[PDB]
Every structure is written in structure tokens, then in C-alpha cells.
Write a protein that binds this DNA or RNA. Structure first.
Ligand SMILES: [Cl-]
Ligand SMILES: [Cl-]
Ligand SMILES: [Cl-]
Ligand SMILES: [Mg+2]
Ligand SMILES: [Mg+2]
Ligand SMILES: [Mg+2]
Ligand SMILES: [Mg+2]
Ligand SMILES: [Mg+2]
Ligand SMILES: [Mg+2]
Ligand SMILES: [Mg+2]
Ligand SMILES: [Mg+2]
Ligand SMILES: [Mg+2]
Ligand SMILES: [Mg+2]
Ligand SMILES: [Mg+2]
Ligand SMILES: [Mg+2]
Ligand code: NA
Ligand code: NA
Ligand code: NA
Ligand code: NA
Ligand code: NA
Ligand code: NA
Ligand code: NA
Ligand code: NA
Ligand code: NA
Ligand code: NA
Ligand code: NA
Ligand code: NA
Ligand code: NA
Ligand code: NA
Ligand code: NA
Ligand code: NA
Ligand code: NA
Ligand code: NA
Ligand code: NA
Ligand SMILES: [Sr+2]
Ligand SMILES: [Sr+2]
Ligand SMILES: [Sr+2]
Ligand SMILES: [Sr+2]
Ligand SMILES: [Sr+2]
Ligand SMILES: [Sr+2]
Ligand SMILES: [Sr+2]
Ligand SMILES: [Sr+2]
Ligand SMILES: [Sr+2]
Ligand SMILES: [Sr+2]
Ligand SMILES: [Sr+2]
Ligand SMILES: [Sr+2]
Ligand SMILES: [Sr+2]
Ligand SMILES: [Sr+2]
Ligand SMILES: [Sr+2]
Ligand SMILES: [Sr+2]
Ligand SMILES: [Sr+2]
Ligand SMILES: [Sr+2]
Lengths: 145, 119, 115, 246
RNA sequence: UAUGCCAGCUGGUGGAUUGCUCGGCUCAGGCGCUGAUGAAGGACGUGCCAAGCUGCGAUAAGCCAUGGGGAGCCGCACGGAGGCGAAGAACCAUGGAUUUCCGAAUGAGAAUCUCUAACAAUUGCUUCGCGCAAUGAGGAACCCCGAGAACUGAAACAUCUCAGUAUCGGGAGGAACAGAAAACGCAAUGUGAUGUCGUUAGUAACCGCGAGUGAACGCGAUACAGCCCAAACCGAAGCCCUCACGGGCAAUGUGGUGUCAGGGCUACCUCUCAUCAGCCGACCGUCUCGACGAAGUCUCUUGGAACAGAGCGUGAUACAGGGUGACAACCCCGUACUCGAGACCAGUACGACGUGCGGUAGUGCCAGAGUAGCGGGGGUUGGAUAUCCCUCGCGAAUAACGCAGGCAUCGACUGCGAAGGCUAAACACAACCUGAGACCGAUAGUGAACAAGUAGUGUGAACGAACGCUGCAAAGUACCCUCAGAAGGGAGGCGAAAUAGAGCAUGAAAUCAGUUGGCGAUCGAGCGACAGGGCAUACAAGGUCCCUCGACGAAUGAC
RNA sequence: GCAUGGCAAGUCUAACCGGAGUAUCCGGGGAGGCACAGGGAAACCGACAUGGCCGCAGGGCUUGCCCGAGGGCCGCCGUC
């Protein structure tokens, strides 16, 4: 049995005094009324902040952490196995509607990898090389200077 | 349709030419064999046997066929009024069985004997 | 008011085992499965790899998922496994249902709970 | 497991591997959910006229004439819910979404689960079906599809000691209630489900309580009418195999 | 024991309840314009008897033809009388005839009539004559173009909101509108007319930066379709009316060419299946209508009635639904299967006729002005500097030019040619047809299951109810008595039932008459709860209870 | 938010398309949404698959002593 189903005979259906549930006065005004007066509490404060750049002058990078790549090396058998060689671009989802692919260095790298991507983070490299690996910056990646 | 309201409605409001089928009755075994049909539209000339009501068992000539009320009058199947007069007790053709046809009309006979169609 | 009939039987079997055999884990896991689904365990392989040890059955009072890498040759007993989870585990060890685990070890000995 | 195959005379004629799906653990709750959804999804939207009871300029006199402040017209109370001939306060509404969603996986799992309940004679018996057989479901040669006369299917069912179920369904119930006023006067027990492969069996369909389906689209409802798992089914050689990949 | 209290019994009153459904409500599919050739609507007529509804129109519930249909018929409406039908009526489909007056209402006028040949009025053509034509008004909503609130929200209120909503003016169609880039701007080596649907997204943008308002490109779909002028160069090679004769139009340009795959011209190559125009003309599918259509009306019992129970039997590509004196696949209509016709798709698709695609070189020959653009003032928008529009003023270039790419200018780059036009399909609505339903079931559901927009209210605009059920069959009560009596009553007749006898299935409560039990003319008021006495009680559905004594014997506890 | 159920580093399809027993239902459709990294107005940069100590449940042992998921207290890491 639900709560609704138990209200018949109660008269006030949980509203307390029958003078309570009336119009918007019982809510202190409609919508966000009083968000700066009687109900300022827990409301985001008033004001403007910052600016926005035009949406077509904005770049959206497709990122991936070494952890993701490294944890699936063997599974990614459909990708080079040299002295593994992996073109991150063929690995990252959503890597199409993105302006470029970037490898981030979150996690560990328990294998020697040769990674090819449009860009890497300092830590991404330190780790890849640290495990006897290399990092190859794509041609597009040739926009660092 | 499948809806009861419409079914009854189409029956009660059927135009006259469509009411002939509301006065049809099953044919005796012989007649069925003779004309290759299971039933026919009862005519004011036919002979019929009552198979259901309080008059079940009686046979007689059809004296009248009312399409408006979809009922028939059969000789001797009557009720006695208060003044003593005798009047017919209407019958639903569904409770009757044709045992002898009145084929005085070439068209009806032709219809009955034809195969592609029934009477 | 669980709705899955199999979950109900499992819980009933888990109690029968804990009451009839020297096993407190089964009755423990039972108490947890009786709790709301949101509190049930959702464990990825990476966690099993970090705290499991061979010849000690890993018991998950929930479901095992496939993220991470498992190398240890361990037997994992769970309410359920994702298709991938059961695959990876079976490669380096073995995936088993609590229903099996309860039958092979009613006393519920040498076992580690993971969530 | 293996399922015995029968010829149109009812005699055994080899046997085949009962596909794995028939080993899916039976999940009556998932099945119930699936049926509940199919049933809700064919329900039609309805609701009272949105202006019903509102076609009146009726006004209240207010205080003064020793009368309750109720809208009146020509001395008759109107519009308001407590007034006879007034509007309905919270009536059925056309805008209401009467459909139920169901993830494809959850639904497919239920179909498989219902398929599997079909191979459990004890269940099939519990569901209510009347039969004198031990193996279930009943598998028959693909020639079954070539049958034309209903009575021929009768003989085969009698030979298969499965006709008793049709006798069970050969009794309609005239329902209590006003459903009758809307065309729902009768209802009847569900009997055998015939699952063929090319086309539904025209020969079996008119049998009392019978249902016909095709392996490619047989659903949770035919497999478990009303959500009750374990319907006495009869598959076709090919139907049986094609149903394996659902 | 009066007046009387409480409960029940018999009979009323009343119309709840149960059951029933010819009406509603909602959804889905199909379909979709009418009118001066006088519509839609209204008035008045029209029947043997005729008030209402329906139909029809002085040929008046109808006339004629063809096909269907069939032995009956003369609407709703179950009367009386009379008539029609084998000379094939009724009825149905298609087509035709008739079709009063008012009504856009059109010769003039007028509350449906009147007065003395009429497209009134405005237009086009014009034989300049109403000679030939157009317009007008209607339609449930849908659609397009204009006019445009307030209550309300912001807890007041003015910007903002409600909302371009309600309502008003004008107008088209079966659908409208839009539409082949002076586009987009995931900026690109990219997309490629337009609606619409899903999403992009409550994102960008707006905003007492409050409350609130709120896109687009793109993407996935639906459906797909692209063309015609102006001018250049030609210059009467042309068009309209008429059978013809003949007339009118047209150098202020008819017609050819041409239309950003720019074109024209001069000089060449090659070639057409592009386009445009016209001819022919479906399949299939969908919707509706129709034909055909299996198998019990067997036994016994109960009943007024078998469609019930028991027994025997049958069909099924048909066990949807309905009817029939009660629960019916097999009694009747239907239903499955198969078949036929009309409508829509669509004058579309295909096919065929004609036309002729395209490429090179040269040529500053052509290419839409109060425009592009700027400023003043307004409105509007998400449009912010960067929306769309109105208004006042100013105002350009000529392809070697010009516009756009979200502030302005200049260069570069990319895109694209405004100031002329047409265009199928995919989408909206629901009048109309058909189907459907976990919708309502007569105080419900429509206001309306009935006389329903009826009766009735208001000067008018406008407002507006209530009323469902005899029975299987009318067998709808003959005769007699009574009475002023076609009233009513009594007796009687019918039927299973008249406590089914006319708002006639059932028949609650309030409440009324009569009556039974209990109380009652010396006695006190939340009307009772719980205990205990009196009196009252047919059966059934409850069967216990009382006294002696004895057993057991908690707290407590004596003489 | 919560309870139940599916699937899980993923999850769900929307419009719509095909089929069919034709509003149900079977198959298809991942456009797009949310989740899988954050911080910063922006430019832009970009993280613990575990390093320490407590310790509940549970497990182990030779019955106080080990292992101790979750949890608790810290380190440390990304960014302004
Ligand atoms: Cl930004
Ligand atoms: Cl985890
Ligand atoms: Cl694009
Ligand atoms: Mg015949
Ligand atoms: Mg109402
Ligand atoms: Mg009831
Ligand atoms: Mg006139
Ligand atoms: Mg206010
Ligand atoms: Mg539109
Ligand atoms: Mg304020
Ligand atoms: Mg707005
Ligand atoms: Mg845009
Ligand atoms: Mg405004
Ligand atoms: Mg009413
Ligand atoms: Mg009565
Ligand atoms: Na209240
Ligand atoms: Na009204
Ligand atoms: Na709805
Ligand atoms: Na139409
Ligand atoms: Na009349
Ligand atoms: Na006429
Ligand atoms: Na005219
Ligand atoms: Na003239
Ligand atoms: Na206010
Ligand atoms: Na005020
Ligand atoms: Na504002
Ligand atoms: Na894209
Ligand atoms: Na009958
Ligand atoms: Na605007
Ligand atoms: Na201006
Ligand atoms: Na542009
Ligand atoms: Na009523
Ligand atoms: Na008493
Ligand atoms: Na996706
Ligand atoms: Sr409350
Ligand atoms: Sr109010
Ligand atoms: Sr509030
Ligand atoms: Sr303040
Ligand atoms: Sr995507
Ligand atoms: Sr009639
Ligand atoms: Sr009649
Ligand atoms: Sr006052
Ligand atoms: Sr196109
Ligand atoms: Sr131009
Ligand atoms: Sr700029
Ligand atoms: Sr009433
Ligand atoms: Sr209505
Ligand atoms: Sr007045
Ligand atoms: Sr009498
Ligand atoms: Sr004692
Ligand atoms: Sr999916
Ligand atoms: Sr921790």
C-alpha cells in the first residue's frame, strides 16, 4: 500500500492545518521568487562572471590516459607489436569530431610502448620513456612552437 | 464489426432488401440435398415445422412474412384473445424448418436451383 | 522484498550453509545481499588483483566487473560477473558462482571478502 | 539435451539436440515484466472531453441570498466538480503516457527464459495444461507446415497424447462485469502454442485456445500467456533450431 | 388507557441499487472543397386520416433509366380504411427529371413579400452590345497575410512576463506556406533547393544580468526535382476570338535566342537522350462496398421457453461479434478462405514524339536602383556591436563589378550573384466514411441515449433543462355487477409472473397509512457505552445455560 | 531521492526502416545523451590500476597472534 492510498479519511493529506495548502503564498511566490530576499539561502549568488569565446574558435581535444592504453595492450592485438607500436588515434573513441588527440599520463605503464599522437603531457612521456618506450608526435602534432 | 452495439445496430437498421436474410430458415434434410443449400428465405407459400417454442412440433403453411419486424405467421400457430378471437403468435424464422417450398415463382425456383447463388 | 527468485534461493542457501556448517561468511554475505541493491558490491578486477592471494577463495557479496588487470591465479566467487569479467578471470584463474562456492566449501574456510 | 522428433502419424523419427536456450534459468519475474509491458503497449489513450461541464457562463451570486457560493445559471448549479452536470475534477487524460519501456536486453532475456520454461514438463503441468506426455516441448517434422485441415492436426495431437489440453480450452467463460457491453463477453483458457518456421499454421490456429507463431518472432506472451511461464508448446523441426538464436 | 416514543410486519410514496444499452467520450486509418448552371442556411408548403421528426418541392415521404434485389410493400409509428406489386413493387447503387419564396442574392424595394425587363456592383476582353467572362457567399478545424489586450508571473511594480496568446480585419486550398543560394562557415582538398520529425539544447544568445525568455549550423531520418523570365544577338518570323469571312492585340516589342553546368556574338570540334513541351497511360498497394461460404436444431430430465444438466454426434484456412423465449463454432446473420466493383495513389511511374547536351579561342556585348549601403525614430527578435521589419532622410558599383563568412575599416583567403518568377513529394486539421477501446453506463458519459439546441428565459447579443426498461407472445383484460360514469371499484379472463396492466425489470432510504412487540397520562433532557433485571421470539443459518457436590486453586486472606 | 530489475567501463536508443500474427509484437537504427578527468574567466595545463598508520565484518592459527576488503587518519599527485 502506498502513502497516497492511505490518505482518504485524513482530511488534510499530510498538509497540517487545512489553511496551509493554498496558492503560491504557501511557496513564497512562484518559481524562484525571493531568491534574493526571503529565500536567499543556498541559492547561487547574484552577478556576472567571466566571458565566453566564440564556439568556432574553440578546440576540443580527445584525451586518453596511458593507463587505458597500457591495460589493453594484448587485447589490442590488431595493433603493431615491435621490439608495442600503437597509434592512439586509432584507439580513442570520439577521436573524429575532435580537433586532435592527446595522451595524458594517469596511471602506470608496465610495457614498452611507442605511442603516436597529436600531443602528450609531460608526465605522459616521462612514464612511457621510463618503461623503455618512445613517443612519436604526429604531423598535426607539429604545432608546438 | 466486433462491437455488440454496432452489430445489433446494423441489424435493426438494415434497409428492406437486406432484411430478407432476417427471415431465413433451415431446410429439411431432403430439400438441403435437393437444392444444395442449408437454408432459405421463408416465403408466404412454404410449409414449415416449429422446432422450439411452445408450438414446437407443429407444422403448417406460412400465412404471412413481416420484414419490418422480421417475423412470420404460420397457420394454426395462434393465441386466443380475451374476447375469444384467435390471432397469430409471430415466430422467429430461426426456430423453424422449411419442409416444403412454394415455387410458383420462376425466379425463386431458378435462384434455388442455380448453384452459384442461394435463395 | 527482492523480486528475483534466484537471488532469493541463493540467500536461502547461503543461510542453510552458515547455520549447518562452520561458516559465518555465508550468513554474512546473506545479510548483505538482503540489503538494498545500491549497497551491493560492484568490484572491478583491479581490486581483486590488489588484495587477493592464491589458494584463498575471493568472495564478492555483489558483482564482478571487467576493468583493470588480474594476473593472480585465484578463484573468484560472486553473485554474478560481467561477460568480460568472467572471461579475464578464467584466463589466469577461475570464476565461480556463490552457489558453487557454497557447495564446495559449506564451512566457508580460507576465504576473503572483497567489495 | 536431446528432443525426440515425431512424424505426422505420431511415430518417433529420430531426434535432435535441444538448443542451449532451453537451459536458460526460468525467471518468472522477468517474464511477468515482459508480458506486462506488451499488454500495456497495445492499450489505447482515452479521456473525457476537456470542455465537458465548462460550456456555461454560470456565475456565483456570492454572499447575500443565504446561499452557498456556487456558480449557477438559470437557477441551476454548474461547472464545479461538486455540481451535478459539472466538470470532472481529475478525469482520465488523453495526454497520459500509457506505454511501458523495457530495455532490449531485459526483454530478450525474458523471451529466452520463457522459451526454457517450455522444456520443463513439471512447470508446463503446473501452469495448468492437460497432457499425458513426459517429454516437452513437443517437436514435430517440418511436414507439419504442409497440413491444411484442422482435423488432421487433431489426429496428430491425439496420437501425441496432447489433445487433452484442447478439450480444456473448449470451454468459454462468460465474464462477470460490464466488459460484455464493450465486446468482451467471453474469455477462454490458453492451450497449445504451435511454433512453425515459414508461416503460422493455418491448420492449427482455429483449435480451441490455440496460438500459432513463427520462430523468428514468437514473443514472451505466446510462450507465457498472462506472464505465467510454461506453456505446452509444439515446435517444428526447423522452428526448434531457428529459435535457438533468439 | 388517550396525545405519543423505539423497532418491525403488510401496503404505499420514492426511484436508490443490480442488471441491460439504440447515446456519449477518446484514439486510429481513409478522405476532403461548395457557390451566379444561384451554394450553405432559412421560410412556407407537401401525406387518405398527419401535430412532431425525417424526406421531398406545386411532378412535393416522391417521377424516369440502367444494374442489383425480390414477394412483398405503403419512413420514424405495433391505427383504421384503402391501395400498389409477376406489366417484377418495396429496397440499394449509379446517372437523370422536377426543384416555391427568402438567402452572396444580383432589375427596384421589402422582417421570406411587392412593384415595372434586368450579370446589381467592381473589373477584363470587346464584335464597345452585359456580346463573352471574372469576382461576391459557405466550410469543423487546419493554413497564409495583417490588427493585437488584460487578468497573470516577477510573491509590490514600471523593462521583462502572461504572449504575438485571446479576440478582430483580409484571403487560399485539400492541404496551405516554403523552395533551387548574392546559402552554409563541424574553416574545409568540406556540405549543396524547401518543409517536417528526432537531436543538437534549456546549449549560444537575451534579461530590474531578477523572475523569466531562448535559437542556429550540423547530424540521424522522411521525401526528393528541378526549372522559367528580363537583357545581350535577332525584329513581326507572333498571339487571341470566329467554322469561315472577318475582327482585335502587337515596333511603348508579339515571337526566336537565353537564364552561373553564365549567356550572347565571331571562328571552330563534337554531339544530342540534359532540359522543356505535349501524347499515352498502369501494376501494386490502401480504404470502402459487395458475392460466395462448412457442421445437430438428436435422446432423457428441469423449465413458460433449452441456448441448462446428463448422453450421443459434427465442422473448422470458420472457436471474431451479434441474433434467436436461459451459458449456441454446428438454429439465423456473419466469421476463414476465394472472388468482384468503386475510390485514392495518379493523368503519377513507365513508354513513346519532338527539342537538342557539351567543349576550345577571342570579344570590358548583356545580366533586375531609391536597390546595396549609411544616418534619425519606432517595433520585434535569442540575435547580443552580430535578428527581422516599418517609417523619415541620404544614397553606389556594373562582373576588370558586387554581396557574404555574427563589431568597424583595409588587404588576403573561402563562398556566393540580391534588387524578376514558377515548382511535385515527405508534414497540419478532422467536416465526412470506416474501424477500435484496461474509457462512461441514464444525477454517468455530450448540454442532448427521449420532443435536444427540444420545452423554456431575455428587447437583444445570448441563455437553456428534464424525460431510457410490460411481456416469450399483446395474449394490451371478453362477459357480468356497481356507478352520473369510456372514470373508479368488485368479480372474472390471459400469462411462469399482473406484487409484469402502461414513466408497466428490480424497487433502498427519508417518509406515510394500518398493525405487532416493548414502554406510556407523578415525571427530566447528547438520545448511548459497558453490567445486570422484565417482557417479546415458528423454522433455517448460533448451542449453549443454570443449581448440589467434588477437583484444581494466583494475588489476597479470615471467623 | 528511494525500492526493485537488466547490462556494466560502459549504458540507452530517438525519429525512422524492414518483417509480421499489422497500434501489440520480432529484427534493425547509437544520431545523440549521460558516464568513462579535472582545474582555470580564458589562454592553457592535465591526476593515486596504492606509499604509511589505525581498524569493523570476515578469514587464518598452535586461541592471545596474523591477514585484514569496505571504513578512518595521513601522505602524495592534477590545476587555479
Ligand atoms: Cl569559452
Ligand atoms: Cl572497483
Ligand atoms: Cl557542412
Ligand atoms: Mg442452390
Ligand atoms: Mg458531467
Ligand atoms: Mg458489478
Ligand atoms: Mg432580388
Ligand atoms: Mg506581480
Ligand atoms: Mg508549415
Ligand atoms: Mg524582484
Ligand atoms: Mg518569447
Ligand atoms: Mg547557423
Ligand atoms: Mg514584447
Ligand atoms: Mg445527462
Ligand atoms: Mg416497476
Ligand atoms: Na489543506
Ligand atoms: Na451551453
Ligand atoms: Na498518450
Ligand atoms: Na473526406
Ligand atoms: Na405528421
Ligand atoms: Na432536389
Ligand atoms: Na456574374
Ligand atoms: Na457589356
Ligand atoms: Na504577487
Ligand atoms: Na498590486
Ligand atoms: Na528585461
Ligand atoms: Na559529423
Ligand atoms: Na433459434
Ligand atoms: Na523581430
Ligand atoms: Na532606419
Ligand atoms: Na557565406
Ligand atoms: Na436519467
Ligand atoms: Na433485555
Ligand atoms: Na553513440
Ligand atoms: Sr507532508
Ligand atoms: Sr484558486
Ligand atoms: Sr519557494
Ligand atoms: Sr538581499
Ligand atoms: Sr558519435
Ligand atoms: Sr420500417
Ligand atoms: Sr417499424
Ligand atoms: Sr457583505
Ligand atoms: Sr535532393
Ligand atoms: Sr542578376
Ligand atoms: Sr572581423
Ligand atoms: Sr433522473
Ligand atoms: Sr460533447
Ligand atoms: Sr437584461
Ligand atoms: Sr381480478
Ligand atoms: Sr492454596
Ligand atoms: Sr541497445
Ligand atoms: Sr583506503
Amino acid at each position: 500500500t502506498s502513502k497516497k492510498k492511505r490518505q482518504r479519511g485524513s482530511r488534510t493529506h499530510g498538509g497540517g492545518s487545512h489553511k496551509n495548502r493554498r496558492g503560491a503564498g504557501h511557496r513564497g511566490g512562484r518559481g524562484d521568487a525571493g531568491r534574493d530576499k526571503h529565500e536567499f539561502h543556498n541559492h547561487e549568488p547574484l552577478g556576472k562572471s567571466g566571458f565566453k569565446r566564440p564556439q568556432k574558435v574553440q578546440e576540443e581535444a580527445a584525451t586518453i590516459d596511458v593507463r587505458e592504453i597500457d591495460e589493453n595492450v594484448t587485447l589490442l592485438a590488431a595493433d603493431d607489436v615491435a621490439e608495442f607500436r600503437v597509434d592512439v588515434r586509432d584507439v580513442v573513441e570520439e577521436a573524429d569530431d575532435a580537433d586532435y588527440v592527446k595522451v595524458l599520463g594517469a596511471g602506470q605503464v608496465r610495457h614498452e610502448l611507442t605511442l603516436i599522437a597529436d600531443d602528450f603531457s609531460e608526465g605522459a612521456r616521462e612514464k612511457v620513456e621510463g618503461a623503455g618506450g618512445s613517443v612519436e608526435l604526429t604531423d598535426l602534432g607539429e604545432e608546438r612552437q | 464489426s466486433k462491437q455488440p452495439d454496432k452489430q445489433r445496430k446494423s441489424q435493426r437498421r438494415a434497409p428492406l432488401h437486406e432484411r430478407h436474410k432476417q427471415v431465413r430458415a433451415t431446410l429439411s434434410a431432403d430439400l438441403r440435398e435437393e437444392y444444395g443449400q442449408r437454408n432459405v428465405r421463408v416465403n408466404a407459400g412454404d410449409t414449415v415445422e416449429v422446432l422450439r417454442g411452445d408450438f414446437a412440433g407443429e407444422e403448417g403453411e406460412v400465412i404471412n412474412v413481416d420484414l419490418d419486424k422480421a417475423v412470420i405467421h404460420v397457420e394454426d400457430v395462434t393465441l386466443e384473445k380475451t374476447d375469444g378471437e384467435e390471432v397469430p403468435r409471430p415466430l422467429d424464422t430461426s426456430n423453424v424448418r422449411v419442409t416444403d417450398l412454394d415455387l410458383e415463382d420462376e425466379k425463386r425456383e431458378a435462384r434455388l436451383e442455380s448453384e452459384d447463388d442461394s435463395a | 522484498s527482492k523480486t528475483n527468485p534466484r537471488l532469493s534461493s541463493l540467500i536461502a542457501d547461503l543461510k542453510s550453509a552458515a547455520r549447518s556448517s562452520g561458516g559465518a561468511v555465508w550468513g554474512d554475505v546473506a545479510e548483505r545481499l538482503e540489503k538494498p541493491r545500491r549497497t551491493h558490491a560492484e568490484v572491478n578486477l583491479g581490486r581483486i588483483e590488489r588484495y587477493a592471494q592464491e589458494d584463498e577463495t575471493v568472495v564478492v557479496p555483489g558483482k564482478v566487473l571487467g576493468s583493470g588487470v588480474l594476473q593472480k591465479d585465484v578463484t573468484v566467487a560472486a553473485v554474478d560477473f560481467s561477460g568480460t569479467a568472467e572471461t579475464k578471470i578464467d584466463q589466469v584463474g577461475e570464476a565461480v558462482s556463490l552457489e558453487q562456492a557454497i557447495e564446495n566449501n559449506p564451512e566457508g574456510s580460507h576465504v576473503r571478502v572483497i567489495r | 539435451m536431446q528432443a525426440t522428433i515425431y512424424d505426422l502419424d505420431g511415430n518417433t523419427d529420430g531426434e535432435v539436440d535441444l538448443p542451449d536456450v532451453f537451459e536458460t534459468p526460468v525467471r518468472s519475474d522477468l517474464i511477468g515484466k515482459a508480458v506486462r509491458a506488451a499488454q500495456a503497449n497495445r492499450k489505447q489513450d482515452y479521456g473525457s472531453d476537456e470542455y465537458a461541464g465548462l460550456r456555461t457562463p454560470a456565475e456565483s451570486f456570492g454572499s447575500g441570498r443565504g446561499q452557498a457560493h456556487v456558480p449557477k445559471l438559470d437557477g441551476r448549479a454548474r461547472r464545479v466538480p461538486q455540481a451535478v452536470k459539472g466538470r470532472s475534477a481529475h478525469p482520465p487524460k488523453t495526454e497520459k503516457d500509457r506505454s511501458l519501456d523495457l530495455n532490449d536486453k531485459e526483454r530478450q532475456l525474458a523471451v529466452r527464459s520463457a522459451l526454457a520454461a517450455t522444456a520443463d514438463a513439471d512447470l508446463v503441468a503446473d501452469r495448468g495444461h492437460e497432457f499425458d506426455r513426459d517429454e516437452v516441448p513437443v517437436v514435430v517434422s517440418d511436414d507439419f507446415e504442409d497440413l491444411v485441415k484442422t482435423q488432421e492436426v487433431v489426429s496428430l495431437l491425439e496420437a501425441l497424447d496432447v489433445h487433452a489440453d484442447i478439450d480444456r480450452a473448449d470451454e468459454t467463460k462468460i465474464k462477470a462485469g460490464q466488459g460484455s457491453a464493450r465486446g468482451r463477453k467471453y474469455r477462454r483458457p490458453a492451450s497449445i502454442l504451435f511454433v512453425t518456421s515459414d508461416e503460422p499454421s493455418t491448420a492449427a490456429r482455429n483449435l480451441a485456445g490455440a496460438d500459432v507463431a513463427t520462430a523468428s518472432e514468437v514473443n514472451t506472451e505466446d510462450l507465457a500467456p498472462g506472464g505465467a511461464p510454461g506453456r505446452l508448446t509444439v515446435f517444428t523441426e526447423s522452428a526448434l533450431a531457428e529459435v535457438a538464436e533468439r
